């Protein structure tokens, strides 16, 4: 009957484009009917077809993005669109390892004289 998203994800890339082409052509006819005094029932189909086009485009874009992220997986430099967004300030932060770097004497102090667990007898 209507478009089911989980069924779209099982289609191939060519099929999605073919279905997208058909949906746009169908929507064009409905637009003509809207200006030629089309029946009220046919005018309600515009909303349904608009939803279908968006769903097909969403599936196509999601598959395309997913494949691209796999191609650049384990690469040093990624396209800016695929890099994490987060916030500007968070991206400029020192990494976790860098923030914890210390001089050799500071390292030795931690090993030689760390805080000890102790208690006072009552």
């Amino acid at each position: 009957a209507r478009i089911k998203v989980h069924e779209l994800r099982n289609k191939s890339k060519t099929e999605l484009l073919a279905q997208l082409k058909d949906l746009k052509a169908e929507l064009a006819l409905l637009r003509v009917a809207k200006v030629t005094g089309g029946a009220p029932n046919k005018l309600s189909k515009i909303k349904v077809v608009r939803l279908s086009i968006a769903q097909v485009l969403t599936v196509i874009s999601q598959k395309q993005k997913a494949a691209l992220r796999e191609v650049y997986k384990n690469k040093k430099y990624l396209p800016l669109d695929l890099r994490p967004k987060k916030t500007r300030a968070i991206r400029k932060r020192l990494t976790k390892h860098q923030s914890s770097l210390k001089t050799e004497r500071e390292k030795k102090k931690e090993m030689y004289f760390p805080l000890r667990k102790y208690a006072i007898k009552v």
Partner: protein
């Protein structure tokens, strides 16, 4: 250990050797723009005791600042006010020429962090400083535990908030006790605290 010889030589600024070298350098600086990148510090011994390290990420710039006081920037030297405020000349800027040199470099070099600066030369018209700046984004700096503190956001534009070595001097923070107590934690913070009218619940 050669730095002590260099440092002690620079303590004799009125000797013939230093007067000649400074005279030639002073001419050379006058012909170049007011802010110039230098390949290496003119005073490596002085630079490294202020934090400079000969590694990628550290850069040195020479800054030229005009000498003298601060004429009040008022049109035609006219002040609309009582005589106590009618002075126009013989007025002095509260910040020092060293601070101005750091600010000039900091504003121009927005992508770098100002670390410190030092005097290198002067004439009757201009005063010359070298400003040490750090590229906080460079990996060598970010992996160095002794300098990577400057990569943190709290240290943005230290020179424009008076947080450099020169900044502490003109804020009155070089010193403590009865002669400098009003300067901490800040002069305006001290004023606001002392002006506060504390109205407790049970009073």
């Amino acid at each position: 250990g050669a730095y002590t010889y260099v440092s002690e030589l620079w303590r004799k600024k009125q000797s013939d050797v230093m007067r000649f070298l400074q005279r030639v350098r002073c001419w050379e600086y006058r012909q170049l723009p007011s802010i110039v990148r230098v390949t290496r510090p003119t005073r490596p011994d002085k630079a490294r005791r202020l934090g400079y390290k000969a590694k990628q990420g550290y850069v040195v710039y020479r800054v030229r600042v005009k000498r003298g006081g601060r004429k009040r920037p008022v049109s035609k030297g006219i002040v609309y006010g009582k005589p106590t405020n009618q002075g126009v000349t013989q007025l002095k800027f509260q910040r020092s020429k060293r601070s101005v040199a750091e600010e000039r470099a900091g504003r121009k070099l927005g992508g770098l962090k100002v670390l410190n600066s030092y005097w290198i030369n002067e004439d009757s018209t201009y005063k010359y400083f070298e400003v040490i700046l750090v590229d906080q984004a460079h990996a060598a700096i970010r992996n160095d535990p002794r300098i990577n503190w400057i990569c943190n956001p709290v240290h943005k534009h230290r020179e424009l908030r008076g947080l450099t070595s020169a900044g502490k001097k003109y804020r009155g923070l070089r010193g403590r006790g009865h002669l400098h107590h009003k300067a901490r934690p800040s002069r305006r913070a001290t004023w606001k605290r002392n002006q506060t009218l504390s109205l407790r619940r049970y009073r």
